[PDB]
Scaffold this motif. Structure first.
Motif, PDB file in Angstrom:
ATOM      1  N   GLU A  91      -2.652  -3.773   8.515  1.00 32.47           N
ATOM      2  CA  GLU A  91      -4.083  -4.109   8.766  1.00 32.47           C
ATOM      3  C   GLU A  91      -4.964  -3.560   7.637  1.00 32.47           C
ATOM      4  N   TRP A  92      -4.785  -2.300   7.236  1.00 34.02           N
ATOM      5  CA  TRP A  92      -5.544  -1.720   6.099  1.00 34.02           C
ATOM      6  C   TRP A  92      -5.295  -2.542   4.829  1.00 34.02           C
ATOM      7  N   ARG A 100     -11.634   5.421  -6.253  1.00 32.24           N
ATOM      8  CA  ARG A 100     -11.082   5.259  -7.626  1.00 32.24           C
ATOM      9  C   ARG A 100     -11.009   3.774  -8.023  1.00 32.24           C
ATOM     10  N   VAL A 116      -2.969  10.579  -3.716  1.00 36.57           N
ATOM     11  CA  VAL A 116      -3.453   9.339  -4.378  1.00 36.57           C
ATOM     12  C   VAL A 116      -3.032   8.166  -3.500  1.00 36.57           C
ATOM     13  N   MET A 138       0.879  -1.194   0.000  1.00 41.21           N
ATOM     14  CA  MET A 138       0.000   0.000   0.000  1.00 41.21           C
ATOM     15  C   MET A 138       0.907   1.233   0.000  1.00 41.21           C
ATOM     16  N   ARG A 139       0.586   2.213  -0.838  1.00 40.24           N
ATOM     17  CA  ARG A 139       1.355   3.469  -0.982  1.00 40.24           C
ATOM     18  C   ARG A 139       0.395   4.646  -1.073  1.00 40.24           C
ATOM     19  N   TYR A 140       0.711   5.729  -0.363  1.00 39.54           N
ATOM     20  CA  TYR A 140       0.067   7.045  -0.557  1.00 39.54           C
ATOM     21  C   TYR A 140       1.116   8.040  -1.046  1.00 39.54           C
ATOM     22  N   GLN A 165      -4.905   2.140  -8.332  1.00 43.04           N
ATOM     23  CA  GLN A 165      -5.334   3.331  -7.567  1.00 43.04           C
ATOM     24  C   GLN A 165      -6.705   3.047  -6.945  1.00 43.04           C
ATOM     25  N   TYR A 193      -8.094  -4.496   2.527  1.00 46.01           N
ATOM     26  CA  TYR A 193      -8.292  -4.166   1.093  1.00 46.01           C
ATOM     27  C   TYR A 193      -8.076  -5.437   0.249  1.00 46.01           C
ATOM     28  N   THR A 249      -0.920  -0.651  11.665  1.00 45.27           N
ATOM     29  CA  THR A 249      -2.153  -0.110  11.019  1.00 45.27           C
ATOM     30  C   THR A 249      -2.089  -0.260   9.484  1.00 45.27           C
ATOM     31  N   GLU A 296     -11.001   9.262   6.551  1.00 43.21           N
ATOM     32  CA  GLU A 296      -9.985   9.453   5.479  1.00 43.21           C
ATOM     33  C   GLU A 296     -10.002  10.912   4.980  1.00 43.21           C
ATOM     34  N   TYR A 345      -2.697   3.854  -3.598  1.00 45.58           N
ATOM     35  CA  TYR A 345      -2.550   2.636  -4.426  1.00 45.58           C
ATOM     36  C   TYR A 345      -2.465   1.441  -3.490  1.00 45.58           C
ATOM     37  N   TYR A 380     -15.624   5.295   7.335  1.00 42.27           N
ATOM     38  CA  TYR A 380     -14.349   5.206   6.589  1.00 42.27           C
ATOM     39  C   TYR A 380     -14.084   6.546   5.868  1.00 42.27           C
TER      40      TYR A 380
END
Ligand SMILES: [Cl-]
Lengths: 99, 201, 275, 9, 240
Positions: free
Chosen positions: C165-166, C47, C24, C4-6, C31, C170, C162, C62, C26, C58
Motif C-alpha cells: 500500500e505504501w 530525501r 534510509v 520499497m526497501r528500508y 532514496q 509513493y 501495508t 515515521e 528507497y 506522516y
C-alpha cells in the motif's frame, strides 16, 4: 568479518575545463562502517565535502558517496584519500579524467 | 475517542451470533486485539488480527476493515458463559503500548425451556426470625428493577448453572429489616410474570 | 517491477555513549527518507521532492516508528553481546533490511526481512513469509523466541499488505521521478597499455534505474574471463554510471563489440572503436 | 512507510 | 501466558499518605511490561510502561505513580503518598511483541480513616419446602453484609470440597448507603442442588467469605475488634 573499500573517483558530468561540475568519491564493499574519506586538490584536503546517508548492498557491505562542487582545470590534480581498519596505509586514488 | 466501543449491554439469546464492534482513530494502526474480562477477573486474550479480512479460532471470528477503521469480534453459537465485558485494543502508529476501549458488556440469555417463576421465603439456618425472598425460575426476558426504598435490598438477576443436570436458572434476592416488608411485595417494582407462584411461608 | 526497501545500521561506540543509528528508505534506486541519531532534527527527513508533499501526520508517525526501531536495536546490541560472550570494549554492528517487490500490475511479488551481525547473516524470513533461516546458534535463540510469539504472522501482514500500500501511494505521488527510465548515453575510450595491446572501455552514463548489463564480445563470444566491470556508481543527480573494459591486441580493436542492455533501451545498443 | 514490529533479537 | 504474569499483593487498604509498591513478575523473558488502572466507565488506563530493563515511560495517567524496571522479569509500581483518587483495580501486563498477557490484578482502597473498615457478617438461608415441592430443587442463599472495603472472595463448600457448579454470586455488591463513597456493602450468592442431595443429611453446605482488611502492623484505637484479614462462614446440613 572485515572487507576493504573499493574506491572510485570521477565527476558527475563529463569534465570540460572551466565548466562547473561535481567531484565524486564512491567507496563501497567495506565493513565495518567506520571509514575516513577526504577529497584532495594537489594533495590538499578540501573542507566543504558532503556524503550520502550510510546504506548497504545485498552482501551487507556499506557504500558512501563523498562529493564537492568543483570547476576542473588542465592544471589542478584531484584525488580521494581513504583509511579503514583493513588498510595498513591510507589508499590514495587520483581522478583520471580521461578514464 | 481513540478506540470507541458502545457500553451495551448487548443482549443476545444463547445459540445466536454476537457482533462486538470497535472503531479506532489512527489509520496507521497495525495491530488489533479482543480481550474478554469476567467481573472481578483480568483481561484474557481472545483474538489478535493484523490484515483486512477474517480470522477464526473456535467459535470466535475477528474481522478487520482498515478502510472504515472498524474491527469486530463475532461469537458464533453464543453460550451464557460468554457473558462478560469485551475489550477492544489497538496499537497506534509507532506506539509500544495498547490503547483499550472502555468495553462492551455482553449478556447471553439462557433459553428457559419451562419457566416456573416463583418467589420463595428462605429462613436463616442458624435460628432467627430472619429471612430472604428468592425470585427464581423466570424467563430470561424478565429483568429485575433494583429497590425504590433504601431499607429494602434487591440484587440484579444472576444465571446459575447446575452443570451436572445441564440446567440453567435465573434468580434475584430481596431482604429488609422492616417488619412490614414481605416476599409477596419484594418484587412489585419489577414486571414479574402473571402466574408467578407465591406460596405462603 | 518496483520495490520499497528500508536499510538500518546500528553501531556500538564504546567510549562515545549511545550507539549510532542510521535509517534510509528507497523506492527502486531513489532514496526518499533518512534518519540519523547524530543529526540535530531527531526527525525522519525527506530525501526526494515527492515525499515532502506528505503532511505532519506522516512525518510524526515515521519519526515515532524510526526512533522506536533505534530503541529496539539499542537493546539488540546488548542481547547479541550476551549471545556471543562479548564485552562492551568492542564496537559491533547490527544491520536490518525489509521491504516488498511488486510487478507491473503493482501486485505483491515477494517480501524481505533480514538481519546481520558484524557483517554476517544472522536471521532472515524465508521467501514463503512463514519460516526463519537462522545463520548460527545465537540466531536459533532468536528464531525460537519469534516462533513462540508468532512474529511471522504480523510481519507477513506488513510485507504483503501495508508495505505494498505504501509503495503504490509513493509510485502514484512520485510518478514523474519513479515511473521513468533514463536511457544510458554510451561512449568508448582507448588506452595503449603496451606496444602489442590496448584497453577498450565501454561507458554507460546518466541511466536510471541502476540495473544494466555491459557485455564485451570478441567475434561474437562474451569475454566473461577477461572483462573488468566496475561497480555501478551514483552520479549524484539521481542517475548511475558504469563501465566495462577489455585489454585487446593493438590493431584488433575492430574485432571487439560492447553490448549495452537497459529497460530504457528499445533496442539493445552495440559499440565499436572510432579513431 | 516503516514496519511497526516490536520484536527483539 | 496470563499464568506467566504474577502480581502482589491481591488486596490492600491504605491510610491516605501511606506508601506501597505493587510487584509485577513474568518468567517469559518479555521485553515489554505495563501498569494499568481500571475504574468503572473508564476502562483500562495505562499509568507507565517499559520497553526493556532500566527504561520506563509515561502512559496516559502517570501523575502520582512511579515505576522501576531494574530487572527484566520485574516491573514495580510505587505509590509515594496514597490518595483516595488512587482507589482502583491495578493490572500489570507483559508482551514479547504487542500481545499483552495480564496479571490477576490488585484491588487497592485508600481511606482517610481506617475506622470505616468492617469485616462481613455471613448468614446461610435454607431452601423453602415450597421450592422443594414445586421444583425438586433446593436453593441456599448466602448473605455477606456490612463489609468495607469491597475486598471479599465468597466460596461455597459442600462436604469440605469447594464447588463451582450450581453457584451464582452477585457480579457486584449493593451499597447499604449509596450516597457515600465509604458505604458498607452487601453481597448475595446462591447454591442450588437437587432436593435429594439437600435431603440426604450426609451432605454439609458452608458459605465462606475471605475478607481482606488490616494487618497486625496496622494501629487500632477503636472499641470493637480490629477488622483484620479473616474468613467469616455460615453453614447448614442436609435434612430429609
Ligand atoms: Cl528503571
Amino acid at each position: 568479518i572485515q572487507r576493504t573499500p573499493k574506491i572510485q573517483v570521477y565527476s558527475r558530468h563529463p569534465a570540460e575545463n572551466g565548466k562547473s561540475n561535481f567531484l565524486n568519491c564512491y567507496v563501497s564493499g567495506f565493513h565495518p562502517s567506520d571509514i575516513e574519506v577526504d577529497l584532495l586538490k594537489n594533495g590538499e584536503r578540501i573542507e566543504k565535502v558532503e556524503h550520502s546517508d550510510l546504506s548497504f548492498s545485498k552482501d551487507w557491505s556499506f557504500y558512501l558517496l563523498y562529493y564537492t562542487e568543483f570547476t576542473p582545470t588542465e592544471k589542478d590534480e584531484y584525488a580521494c584519500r581513504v583509511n579503514h581498519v583493513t588498510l595498513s596505509q591510507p589508499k590514495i586514488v587520483k581522478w583520471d579524467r580521461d578514464m | 475517542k481513540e478506540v470507541e466501543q458502545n457500553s451495551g449491554p448487548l443482549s443476545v439469546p444463547e445459540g445466536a451470533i454476537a457482533s462486538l464492534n470497535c472503531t479506532y482513530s489512527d489509520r496507521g494502526s497495525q495491530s488489533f486485539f479482543w480481550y474478554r474480562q469476567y467481573s472481578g477477573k483480568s483481561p484474557e486474550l481472545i483474538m489478535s488480527i493484523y490484515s483486512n479480512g477474517d480470522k477464526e479460532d473456535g467459535r470466535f471470528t475477528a474481522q478487520l476493515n482498515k478502510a472504515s477503521q472498524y474491527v469486530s469480534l463475532l461469537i458464533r453459537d453464543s453460550q451464557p458463559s460468554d457473558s462478560a465485558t469485551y475489550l477492544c485494543a489497538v496499537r497506534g502508529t509507532g506506539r509500544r503500548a495498547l490503547t483499550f476501549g472502555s468495553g462492551t458488556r455482553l449478556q447471553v440469555q439462557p433459553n428457559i425451556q419451562n419457566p416456573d417463576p416463583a418467589v420463595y421465603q428462605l429462613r436463616d439456618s442458624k435460628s432467627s426470625d430472619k429471612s430472604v425472598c428468592l425470585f427464581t425460575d423466570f424467563d430470561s426476558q424478565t429483568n429485575v428493577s433494583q429497590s425504590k426504598d433504601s431499607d429494602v435490598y434487591i440484587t440484579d438477576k444472576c444465571v446459575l448453572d447446575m452443570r451436572s443436570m445441564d440446567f440453567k436458572s435465573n434468580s434475584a434476592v430481596a431482604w429488609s429489616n422492616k417488619s412490614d416488608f414481605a416476599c409477596a411485595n419484594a418484587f412489585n417494582n419489577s414486571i414479574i410474570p402473571e402466574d408467578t407462584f407465591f406460596p405462603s411461608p | 517491477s518496483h520495490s520499497m526497501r528500508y536499510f538500518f545500521t546500528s553501531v556500538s561506540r564504546p567510549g562515545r555513549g549511545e550507539p549510532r543509528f542510521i535509517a534510509v528508505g528507497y523506492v527502486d534506486d531513489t532514496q526518499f527518507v533518512r534518519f540519523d541519531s547524530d543529526a540535530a532534527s531527531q526527525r525522519m527527513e525527506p530525501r526526494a521532492p515527492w515525499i515532502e508533499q506528505e503532511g505532519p501526520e506522516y512525518w510524526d508517525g515515521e519519526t515515532r516508528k524510526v526512533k522506536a526501531h533505534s530503541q529496539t536495536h539499542r537493546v539488540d546490541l546488548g542481547t547479541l553481546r550476551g549471545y556471543y560472550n562479548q564485552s562492551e570494549a568492542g564496537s559491533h554492528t547490527v544491520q536490518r533490511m525489509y521491504g516488498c517487490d511488486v510487478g507491473s500490475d503493482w501486485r505483491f511479488l515477494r517480501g524481505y526481512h533480514q538481519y546481520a551481525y558484524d557483517g554476517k547473516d544472522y536471521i532472515a524470513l524465508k521467501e514463503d513469509l512463514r519460516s526463519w533461516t537462522a545463520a548460527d546458534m545465537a540466531a536459533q535463540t532468536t528464531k525460537h523466541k519469534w516462533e513462540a510469539a508468532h512474529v511471522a504472522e504480523q510481519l507477513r501482514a506488513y510485507l504483503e499488505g501495508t508495505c505494498v500500500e505504501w509503495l503504490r501511494r509513493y509510485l502514484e505521488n512520485g510518478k514523474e521521478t519513479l515511473q521513468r527510465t533514463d536511457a544510458p548515453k554510451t561512449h568508448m575510450t582507448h588506452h595503449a597499455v603496451s606496444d602489442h595491446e590496448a584497453t577498450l572501455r565501454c561507458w554507460a552514463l546518466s541511466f536510471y534505474p541502476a540495473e544494466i548489463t555491459l557485455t564485451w564480445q570478441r567475434d561474437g563470444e562474451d569475454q566473461t574471463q577477461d572483462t573488468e566491470l566496475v561497480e555501478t556508481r551514483p552520479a549524484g543527480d539521481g542517475t548511475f554510471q558504469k563501465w566495462a573494459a577489455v585489454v585487446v591486441p593493438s590493431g584488433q580493436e575492430q574485432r571487439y563489440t560492447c553490448h549495452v542492455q537497459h529497460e530504457g533501451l528499445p533496442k539493445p545498443l552495440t559499440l565499436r572503436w572510432e579513431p | 512507510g516503516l514496519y511497526d514490529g516490536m520484536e527483539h533479537l | 501466558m496470563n499464568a506467566g504474569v504474577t502480581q502482589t499483593p491481591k488486596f490492600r487498604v491504605l491510610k491516605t499518605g501511606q506508601s506501597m509498591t505493587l510487584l509485577c513478575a513474568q518468567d517469559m523473558n518479555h521485553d515489554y511490561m505495563y501498569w494499568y488502572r481500571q475504574d468503572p466507565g473508564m476502562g483500562l488506563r495505562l499509568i507507565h510502561y517499559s520497553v526493556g530493563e532500566g527504561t520506563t515511560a509515561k502512559g496516559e495517567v502517570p501523575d502520582g505513580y512511579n515505576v522501576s524496571r531494574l530487572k527484566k522479569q520485574n516491573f514495580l509500581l510505587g505509590l509515594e503518598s496514597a490518595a483516595p483518587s488512587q482507589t482502583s483495580v491495578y493490572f500489570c501486563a507483559s508482551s514479547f511483541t504487542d500481545t499483552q498477557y495480564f496479571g490477576p490484578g490488585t484491588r487497592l482502597t485508600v481511606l482517610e480513616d481506617l475506622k470505616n473498615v468492617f469485616p462481613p457478617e455471613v448468614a446461610v438461608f435454607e431452601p423453602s419446602e415450597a421450592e422443594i415441592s414445586h421444583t425438586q430443587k433446593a436453593t441456599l442463599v448466602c448473605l455477606a453484609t456490612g463489609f468495607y472495603p469491597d475486598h471479599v472472595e465468597l466460596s461455597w463448600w459442600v462436604n469440605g470440597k469447594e464447588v463451582h457448579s450450581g453457584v451464582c454470586t452477585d457480579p457486584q455488591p449493593l451499597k447499604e448507603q449509596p450516597a457515600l463513597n465509604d458505604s458498607r456493602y452487601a453481597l448475595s450468592s446462591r447454591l442450588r442442588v437437587s432436593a435429594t442431595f439437600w435431603q440426604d443429611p450426609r451432605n454439609h453446605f458452608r458459605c465462606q467469605v475471605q475478607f481482606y482488611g488490616l494487618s497486625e502492623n496496622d494501629e487500632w484505637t477503636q472499641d470493637r475488634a480490629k477488622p483484620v484479614t479473616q474468613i467469616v462462614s455460615a453453614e447448614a446440613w442436609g435434612r430429609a
